[model samples]
Target: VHKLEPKDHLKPQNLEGISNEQIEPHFEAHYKGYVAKYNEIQEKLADQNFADRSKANQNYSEYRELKVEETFNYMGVVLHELYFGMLTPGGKGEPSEALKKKIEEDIGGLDACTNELKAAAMAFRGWAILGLDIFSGRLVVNGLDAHNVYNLTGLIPLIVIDTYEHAYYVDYKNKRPPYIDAFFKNINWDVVNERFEKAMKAYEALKDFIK
Candidate 1:
């Protein structure tokens, strides 16, 4: 895989995220028929040396395009991993230590960070995320696309908001605030804190890279 930008390639967050009910036949017409085929045939290809480019270029371009689809399983792999991470059966919540420290480390307190996260959701037009606060930590933000949003990632990403129209097209329609409210109810904070604990240590060791 090449350098995939954040959200450029992503796994659906949950099984319900791409429910069959949600995926109307129109989606097939839109995605497989139009978008995929368009991406294949579009003349806007940047690297025009299709036949004679470096072997690497030719190989990767195949995966990048929709022409001879081979690497089409990335999304499935990513989504399943994220689903597993989020669906931990026996995992539990942050200890008092974790809760206290996360608040102090990130926002001086839990309420403040919640306010920041909620406010971020309010301010953001597309989507808002409370990802591992890695700005100053040793851990770098390796925007893992189609991978576990948290492999207990020596990180945590709480309170995700998907403002895309497809996510709430049925009930909320254009009413994003209610969708956000509905989304928040589904957060598994225990799983999030497990990620936080793992992330803190990994980040500490990598702290030398913290610039």
Candidate 2:
């Protein structure tokens, strides 16, 4: 079984608009919970006789259930890692030149990109991701209603924003916009730039096969 570890270093502190009170519980409970559950699922799957494959069913089965929750917990760990990794205390910094150019070409401008992401956070029930479509080599924003649903294939997420109530209920309560605003302000653009650079490299390596 592949063991997963939580990225504790990525956890944010002393954020500009977001509070420690809000992040503390969300990080300890939701984020770490995903990590723990994902590891548990992996452990269970390690057992060769954990579920009977022949008896699998769409409606219900041990095998089917494990497979379903596998993606949910796995993606929960992934998105939360990205979300937390991209945030910083002061939200200071700007995108790299290459990233800025891409944003300009694909999403109109930085401000437009911010607007679109905020709109996505409000529009979607779960998460908003700014990702690079590896196939097309274009920047795109995607909204996912759940951890395992509505994901864009071949997309490498560069920025992740959680819009779930558990993310902000303690701090912002029912006001999502303020929480959204705070999220934007806390973004670590340097990390985003690094991710974009790495994504572009991967896109180049796979472009021929993808086309």
Candidate 3:
């Protein structure tokens, strides 16, 4: 079984609008919990006889349920990592020149991209992701209502925002707009730039296989 480790460096501190108190449980309970659960699912699947494949059914079956939960927990682990990985205190830095140019060409501009992301955050219950659409080789914003739901097939996530209430309920109460604003304020553009660069390379390498 492949083991996944939680990223300790993802811990954000001294962020504007988002308090350390809010981050504490969100990191420990939610993010790490996903890592743990994903690992657990992997371990269970490692058992050759864990479930009978022939008995698999769409409505109810051990194999089907496990496989479904596997994607859910796996996506939870992945999206949380991306969400936490791209944030910093006081939102330091700006996008790289190459990334900025692509943002302008593909998503209209930086301001427009920000608006789209924020709008996605409000629209989705789970996450808002800025990703590279491998099909078009352009940037796109996507909203996921659940960890594994509404996810585009050929998108490589670059920036991820956890719009779940657990992400901000402690700090902003019932309102999500201020939390969304805070998320924008704390974006680590350097990380996003790196992801974008990597995604571009990946898209080039996989373009033939994609279609």
Candidate 4:
């Protein structure tokens, strides 16, 4: 399997709002740990028995445990990578013109989307993702209580905001509201808009194939 050597763009050295001390540990220990553990689980699964696999109970065989945990770790790595990718030195950039219009069309207005994002960040323990929903042909803001739950098919995640305690507790402790705001302050909108554009193109290609 290929390795994930994601760059330290979220180095936090010159990044506004977020701190270096927090980024280093958050990425090195927490995020890196997710990547490492995912690799370990994949290796273990390579030799495992498919016959033993059973999702009968929440707690099943080693196969089931590995399968479920793989989803958790897989999302942990992906979500963290997406979050880190959207971090830059000076902090938030305005969304592209096309993206702004799309957001306005889908969610009424930017202010409304921002409010919804804040609400999702506060309500969800794991993550708040902004994506171009292929199924709906519109932008949507949604969150997961856990990494492996509430995942919507045809949702192409564009901006992944990690709301897990590790993302904020280091810098802001239990004060998550302000911490969540700080994360927004640092979002790289260029990256966001690019992802949105690419995702929308993907939808355009497949739109006729589905509904």
Pairs in steric clash, model 3 = none
lDDT of 2 by residue, 32-112 (tens): 998999888888877768767777799998888888999999999999989988898877678899998999999999999
- Candidate that scores best on lDDT: 2
Give the higher-TM-score candidate: 1 or 3: 3
Candidate 3 stretches greater than 4 Å from native:
208-211
Q: Report the alpha-carbon TM-score of model 1 versus the true structure.
A: 0.51
Error of 4 at 124 (Å): 0.8
Q: What does the lDDT read for residue 202 in candidate 2? A: 95
Clashes of 1: 4
lDDT against the true structure, each candidate: 0.45, 0.90, 0.88, 0.81
Q: For candidate 4, lDDT tens digit of each residue in 1-211?
A: 4446655664555566778878888888988888888888887776545425443356567777777899899888888888898888677678898888988999988899889998998889889988888876888887898788897776899878888888888788999998878887888888888887798889888786664
- TM-score for every candidate vs. truth? 0.51, 0.95, 0.94, 0.90
Question: Could you give the candidate ranking by TM-score, starting with the highest?
Answer: 2, 3, 4, 1
Model 3, C-alpha of 104: deviation from truth (Å): 1.4
Query: Which stretch of 10 consecutive residues in model 1 shows the poorest summed lDDT?
Result: 1-10
Q: Write down the worst ten-residue block by lDDT for model 2.
A: 45-54
